[PDB]
């Protein structure tokens, strides 16, 4: 009748988790691949899309740390530091 969506598999193959454990602010993958958007993994990376300019990757520990790391300010989305776009 209804076909279910498949779960998420860590890029390192260490675990299979439902997609509700992706960006859920808890580290489930040894490679940090389930938390690309949060500060939850000690070895993760956050991608600064920097629309129009050179993209950069930063440490996951710099996501919502209150410091402006990406020139587009997208690393600070729920911290109480409002970052301005400084890509130019």
């Amino acid at each position: 009748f209804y076909e279910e969506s498949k779960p998420f598999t860590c890029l390192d193959g260490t675990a299979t988790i439902p997609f509700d454990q992706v960006n859920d602010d808890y580290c489930d993958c040894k490679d940090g691949s389930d938390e690309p958007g949060t500060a939850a993994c000690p070895n993760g990376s956050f991608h600064c899309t920097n629309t129009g300019y050179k993209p950069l990757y930063i440490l996951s520990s710099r996501v919502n740390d209150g410091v402006c790391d990406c020139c587009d300010g997208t690393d600070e989305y729920n911290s109480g530091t409002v970052c301005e776009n400084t890509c130019r």
Partner: protein
């Protein structure tokens, strides 16, 4: 060190006079006809049988198992000094009742017992007992000596010269001294600051321990020379009891220790003032800590950032250097909270100023550090350049606030500089007001302060300090007040940082010099140490000697101040420093740069690991400091404090504990491949925090180590909170989720607390805005409850994980919390180590909750 620059006992005429008095029949006797007893005190006249000088003894029983003894002249030519501002209150008394009396003795009961005091008239003696157990005797060896004030004007009793410095000594010989006997005590500790063993040595065949705040260039180890601070408090420990002696005197003091059925005798000899001594009768060491804290207060609660890592040197060159150092931490993923500015930042060592070439825009530099959520510390010393163009000098000179010589002129130390009289309350008020953002131009809320050379250090002075006959507030001589000068500098600076914020922000001030009560104002450090393995080792007994006498916020310069440490030593020093209360790397002007990313990768990695361990433990450190602030219990502790009946722990100084939960044995030898770790406790278990391997006490474990090893064990029965998400500074982390590390006792139990607040204001005290949680494990349930229901805090902090060491594999894990439906948690379990990891509890740290492990 150049020992010829510092007086030995034979070169200090009052020490030589006092020490020449040998054990015998005391010439002092109490005149029992003069005895008067009131609800607060017993008073009685004493007489010296030869000189006929009359003294007054004021004997008091005090609440909390203490006794106070004060002795002064009955009819002095001029008043003797009594130490002000150290005691936090007038101590609550306990009534003395006469329970026995004859022609030569009076037995006194304290309140309704069990403590008793026996006063013997001839020779004068005091005995302190609990029921039939003799705790201490006073004047048992007849060494009491009270030099009365003679008509103002043998060798060195009056005018006295040391090297080229002449002390005019207008009041002549006025020293005071008294001995104490401690039956059953073989181990004594305290009386910092000395670069010596934790367990104090007998002084019989050498020098007494000296307490005189002094700047000792290139100080050496294992000797009793006086260093920068002086805390005249001695603790005595045995299997049966703990006692403390607090000798409230601010003058140069020498302490003789002798042994003798086992018994230790202590003799205190002070240049001036009265005899004012508190006997702290315990019976436990924690009772002695509470007793002493009731007298002099508790450790000030450090703002959280000050418990992070501090990067310093003499000197960061300019704004570009500070900003490069800041960026270096971030480029190398090494956390750091504070960058320090030594004396080269000011305009030619005019404090409260900035070098216009090196630091032209200090507010901009501070704004850059604030954008990284970091702080800066600037040095501010208590010597003021004699310069008519310098506003600070002009104001102090115009208001007559400098220390004076006898002729009334402002004292000038040539190299010139004048010394503000910090003993004058108006001078301290002026100093505090100088820290306002309007007065200290270029300062900002993320700028904190370091008080150095506050002994005071005087380059052309005798023993590199102030002349004995300089004159202070109220007409007191420098000899009367010396050991509290530094404390007043520390106090006034702390008050300045509080006042500039309108009383909201907690201060952070590091001080070199200190006295009893200095714990109330900030941190202290062991001064100018050296980049050598034996100085790394001595950081433990020096900070433990400080912890025992209430100064919990202690540290030593990481890497050593003088000379260049080899990379292996620098790594081991970061590891040691990472587990000590005040954690700062600092280095002398002539050393090579030693920022941790300058080393080869293996060394950088081991240092980063140490920094990550420290940052993750910040919630634990903060909670231990809250307990120090509330109870007066030390943060860093000798093993005997936790194992008072284990005689094998009484002298241990190559390991220590943090609270009751972590035992640390840092590697402190070059080329070490293992360490001998003593794990105490008859029915205790210890978990290696790296491997999770469980070890049963008591045992000596030979633990293998590598360069990155920091031997740390968690005690069974404890719960340690950590922030596992290590960020660049503590401000970045202070709203993050917590991981609880539960180490099960053999009975399957554990407990631990957690203190949280905004990390930097007095709101915890003025608004009760904080949390104090208790975590408790028993049976198969972990519970969070309030340890102080008055504390409420709006916080996003949640519990992200629970790690349980010594647990079996459950069938189900259930979380209950008011306002939520019952939750089922996923978990992981390692059967080899019996480590259970509970995934994402997700509950607020402010809420009560329970997690039940089902065997189902």
């Amino acid at each position: 060190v150049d020992r010829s620059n510092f007086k030995t006992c034979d070169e200090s005429s009052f020490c030589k006079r006092q020490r020449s008095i040998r054990p015998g029949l005391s010439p002092y006797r109490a005149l029992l006809d003069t005895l008067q007893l009131g609800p607060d005190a017993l008073t009685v006249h004493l007489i010296h049988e030869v000189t006929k000088v009359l003294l007054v003894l004021e004997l008091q029983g005090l609440q909390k198992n203490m006794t106070r003894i004060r002795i002064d002249e009955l009819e002095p030519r001029r008043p003797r000094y009594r130490v002000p501002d150290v005691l936090v209150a007038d101590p609550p008394t306990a009534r003395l009742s006469v329970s026995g009396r004859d022609d030569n003795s009076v037995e006194l009961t304290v309140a309704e017992g069990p403590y008793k005091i026996i006063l013997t008239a001839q020779p004068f003696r005091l005995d302190l007992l609990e029921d039939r157990s003799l705790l201490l005797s006073v004047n048992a060896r007849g060494l009491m000596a009270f030099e009365h004030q003679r008509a103002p004007r043998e060798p060195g009793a009056w005018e006295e010269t040391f090297k080229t410095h002449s002390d005019s000594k207008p009041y002549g010989p006025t020293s005071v001294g008294l001995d104490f006997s401690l039956p059953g005590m073989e181990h004594v500790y305290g009386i910092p600051e000395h670069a010596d063993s934790l367990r104090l040595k007998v002084t019989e065949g050498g020098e007494p321990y000296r307490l005189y705040n002094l700047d000792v260039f290139q100080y050496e180890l294992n000797n009793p020379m006086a260093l920068y601070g002086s805390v005249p408090v001695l603790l005595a420990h045995s299997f049966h009891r703990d006692l403390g002696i607090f000798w409230l005197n601010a003058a140069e003091t020498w302490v003789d220790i002798s042994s003798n059925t086992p018994q230790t005798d202590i003799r205190w000899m002070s240049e001036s003032g009265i005899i004012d001594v508190f006997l702290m009768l315990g019976p436990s060491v924690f009772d002695v800590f509470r007793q002493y804290a009731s007298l002099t207060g508790t450790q000030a609660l450090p703002p959280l950032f000050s418990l992070g890592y501090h990067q310093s040197r003499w000197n960061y060159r300019d704004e570009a250097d500070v900003l490069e150092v800041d960026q270096g931490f971030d480029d190398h993923n090494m956390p750091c909270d504070v960058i320090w500015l030594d004396i080269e930042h000011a305009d030619g060592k005019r404090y409260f100023t900035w070098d216009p070439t090196r630091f032209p825009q200090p507010l901009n530099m501070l704004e850059h550090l604030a954008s990284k959520r970091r702080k800066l510390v600037a040095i501010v010393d208590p010597h003021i350049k004699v310069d008519s163009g310098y506003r600070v000098h002009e104001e102090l000179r115009n208001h007559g606030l400098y220390v004076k010589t006898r002729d009334g002129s402002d004292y000038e130390g040539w190299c010139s500089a004048s010394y503000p009289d910090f003993t004058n309350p108006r001078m301290r008020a002026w100093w505090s007001n100088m820290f306002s953002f309007d007065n200290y131009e270029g300062s900002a809320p993320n700028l904190y302060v370091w008080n150095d050379m506050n002994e005071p250090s005087v380059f052309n002075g005798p023993e590199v300090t102030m002349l004995k006959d300089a004159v202070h507030y109220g007409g007191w001589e420098h000899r009367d007040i010396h050991n509290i000068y530094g404390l007043y500098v520390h106090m006034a600076t702390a008050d300045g940082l509080i006042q500039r914020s309108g009383g909201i922000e907690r201060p952070f001030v590091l001080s070199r010099a200190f006295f009893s009560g200095s714990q109330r104002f900030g941190a202290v450090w062991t001064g100018d140490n050296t980049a050598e393995w034996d100085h790394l080792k001595i950081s433990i007994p020096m900070c433990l000697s400080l912890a025992l006498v209430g100064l919990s916020f202690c540290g030593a310069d990481v890497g050593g101040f003088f000379k260049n440490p080899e990379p292996e030593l620098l790594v081991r020093w970061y590891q040691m420093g990472a587990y000590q209360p005040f954690f700062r790397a600092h280095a002398h002007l002539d050393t090579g740069r030693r920022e941790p990313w300058l080393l080869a990768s293996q060394y950088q990695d081991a240092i980063r690991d140490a920094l990550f361990q420290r940052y993750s433990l910040l919630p634990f450190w903060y909670t231990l400091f809250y307990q120090a602030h509330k109870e007066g219990f030390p943060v860093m502790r000798p093993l005997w404090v936790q194992y008072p009946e284990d005689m094998s722990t009484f002298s241990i100084e190559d390991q220590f504990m943090l609270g009751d939960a972590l035992l640390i044995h840092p590697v402190s030898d070059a080329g070490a491949h293992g360490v001998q770790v003593y794990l105490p406790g008859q029915e205790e278990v210890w978990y290696d925090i790296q491997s999770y391997q469980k070890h049963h006490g008591p045992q000596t474990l030979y633990l293998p180590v590598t360069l990155s090893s920091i031997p740390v064990f968690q005690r069974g029965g404890t719960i340690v909170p950590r922030w596992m998400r290590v960020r660049r500074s503590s401000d970045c982390m202070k709203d993050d989720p917590i991981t609880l590390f539960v180490a099960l006792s053999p009975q399957g139990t554990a407990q631990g607390e957690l203190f949280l607040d905004d990390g930097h204001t007095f709101n915890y005290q003025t608004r009760h805005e904080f949390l104090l949680r208790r975590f408790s494990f028993s049976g198969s349930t972990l519970v969070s409850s309030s340890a102080d229901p008055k504390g409420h805090l709006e916080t996003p902090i949640w519990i992200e994980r629970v790690v349980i060491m010594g647990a079996g594999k459950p069938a189900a894990v259930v979380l209950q919390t008011k306002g939520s439906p019952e939750s089922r948690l996923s978990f992981q379990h390692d059967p080899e180590t019996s480590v259970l990891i509970l995934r994402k509890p997700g509950v607020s740290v402010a809420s009560d909750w329970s997690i039940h492990l089902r065997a189902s």
